[PDB]
């Protein structure tokens, strides 16, 4: 009927009780432009995980959206509202893992299921640059071999991969505590020189500023290695979901 779907690329807080707040990356079915946006608002429905219709309310219209997005430095080449469409994944999506044991995760998957997973090589970081590592061709080589490319990349790389329509599966491994991290590292990678504190602080930063890129989250129990079996199921489950893709 009337409706179309959008993806937000700005954070917004409702100033009306009939409104809906949103984070970046949230999808909405715009159900009614409410007199062509002339009241400043649209009627939208929030789409939940497994694409179910969760909450209904008013959001800003396109003009006010574009205007609200001007003020936060959110470094994004995306429109404030992106026109968006559901599609079955037409290839094996690259997999990005974040959190205090993502390196162990990557290594274990590539070692134990070499037929399903392969670590994509990354470019050396250049001395005297920012906080372009994996080239697109490298990922294509792995995709064409019927495998998931494991990517050791930056949140900004993920954003960029989203923009180029490569839509990685992004898993966050959530730590219980700093101590938890230390304990898991002793058991899983005692040779590692990386700092448990640094990795824990980096995850807190990741969760707080960047949660909107996560496709899915697994909570770590530092007592046991159950996170691994759950990692393998989560990626398969994610690969089997329809994807929100840019329209046009």
From Swiss-Prot:
Q: Name the organs or tissues of expression.
A: The alpha-containing isoform is found in most epithelial cell junctions. The short isoform is found both in endothelial cells and the highly specialized epithelial junctions of renal glomeruli and Sertoli cells of the seminiferous tubules.
Coiled-coil ranges per UniProt: none
Say which domain of life the source belongs to: Eukaryota
The record's subcellular location field reads: Cell membrane; Cell junction, Tight junction; Cell junction; Cell junction, Gap junction
Q: How is it modified after translation?
A: Phosphorylated at tyrosine redidues in response to epidermal growth factor (EGF). This response is dependent on an intact actin microfilament system. Dephosphorylated by PTPRJ.
Ranges for region Occludin (OCLN)-binding region: 81-248
Q: Ranges for the SH3 domain?
A: 1-69
Domain (Guanylate kinase-like) spans 74-224
Q: What is known of its domains?
A: The 244-aa domain between residues 633 and 876 is the primary occludin (OCLN)-binding site and is required for stable association with the tight junction. The C-terminal region (residues 1151-1372) is an actin-binding region (ABR) that interacts directly with F-actin and plays an important role in the localization of TJP1 at junctions. The ABR is also required for the localization to puncta at the free edge of cells before initiation of cell-cell contact. The ABR is also necessary for TJP1 recruitment to podosomes.
Q: How does it assemble?
A: Homodimer. Forms heterodimers TJP3. Forms a heterodimer (via PDZ2 domain) with TJP2/ZO2 (via PDZ2 domain). Interacts with OCLN, CALM, claudins, CGN/cingulin, CXADR, GJA12, GJD3 and UBN1. Interacts (via ZU5 domain) with CDC42BPB and MYZAP. Interacts (via PDZ domain) with GJA1. Interacts (via PDZ domains) with ANKRD2. Interacts with POPDC1 (via the C-terminus cytoplasmic tail). Interacts with HSPA4 and KIRREL1. Interacts with DLL1. Interacts with USP53 (via the C-terminal region). Interacts (via ABR region) with F-actin.
Q: Which family does it belong to?
A: Belongs to the MAGUK family.
Function of the molecule: TJP1, TJP2, and TJP3 are closely related scaffolding proteins that link tight junction (TJ) transmembrane proteins such as claudins, junctional adhesion molecules, and occludin to the actin cytoskeleton. Forms a multistranded TJP1/ZO1 condensate which elongates to form a tight junction belt, the belt is anchored at the apical cell membrane via interaction with PATJ. The tight junction acts to limit movement of substances through the paracellular space and as a boundary between the compositionally distinct apical and basolateral plasma membrane domains of epithelial and endothelial cells.
This chain belongs to the protein called: Tight junction protein 1
Q: Which organism is it from?
A: Homo sapiens
